[PDB]
Amino acid sequence: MVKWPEYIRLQRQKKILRMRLKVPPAIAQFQYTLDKNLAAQAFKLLNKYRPETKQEKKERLLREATAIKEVSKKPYTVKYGLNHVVGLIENKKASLVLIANDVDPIELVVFLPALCRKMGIPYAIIKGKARLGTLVHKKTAAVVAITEVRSEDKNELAKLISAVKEGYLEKVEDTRKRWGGGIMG
Amino acid sequence: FKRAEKYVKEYREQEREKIRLARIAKQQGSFHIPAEAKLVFVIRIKGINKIPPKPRKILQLLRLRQINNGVFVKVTKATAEMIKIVEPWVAYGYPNLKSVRELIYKRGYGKVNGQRIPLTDNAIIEENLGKYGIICIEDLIHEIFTVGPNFKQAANFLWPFKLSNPNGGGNREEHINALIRAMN
């Protein structure tokens, strides 16, 4: 019959291979992702705490420059970058960690759920590194973290943390240890 | 499929409208406006999906159901109370001469025998009304602007206006002109 292109066949066969092999638990834990509602709540908070784009940064710096020509507190933003976020988790500064599920060299993030479990930081696996990228004005973002916030929504952050630790961490608690996949049947 | 947050949001809007209706019904309906009768254009905007019975009755008495409908309304005590009831859905204020003139010259239609025709001829409007003193379109223009006894029949004659949806263009007294300017 008709012939499919080669890279499309590679994509679909990589699908079937990654879903129907006996996957180790460290990799099989990434198939369990946040629901729609909890991801929406988390992204509402993280959209409240987005960083500034280049245009806003230059605009603000021009404003301070002309104010000097003619007082501030510490800025609170979503923290990103893999090594930076790992350093924040290790020093117990991060409060909530959101890890993308489609990092192509998956070794860069396999130790991250275990690390968050060890240091005690609440974590959740989200659908899409491109979603985390839009939040930080980049194309993609392997992981984001929130450490501290402004006063007016601290309670909200706390509730969100409790939400994931009641809504994602205990639904993952038993299946985070088990091998995934298989063709038994 | 409809989610629970929609249900709770709906209920919160309905409850807030219920207390607001009780507040306006209990309090004596006197606006901070002189007792002289005025004229205001009223254009209703999308807001709350579910309409309480008294607001939908007032909107039906003021014939505003379809998308982006506008009607001129007198200002006396009863009409002030009526428009204060339906404040969150309508936007009102004093129009200008060029506003009503352009608005009726671009979009002026008539209702007779339960059907809606465009204003095509002055003979059509003279066959439609006949004998109350109106003789042309400029006649009902200055009948709308300058006050007179022939408001009710002329307002019942005119279909209300289906203004085109804008692309980005409380109470105010003069910004309504820019609104209908961008609404047309």
Partner: peptide, 22 residues
């Protein structure tokens, strides 16, 4: 009867969890 109720409940659960759009 029971199968229709189970299918409707599963469809509603999928709409609640994974959403409706796409």
């Amino acid at each position: 009867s029971k199968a229709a109720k189970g299918a409707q409940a599963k469809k509603a659960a999928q709409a609640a969890l994974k959403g409706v759009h796409s």
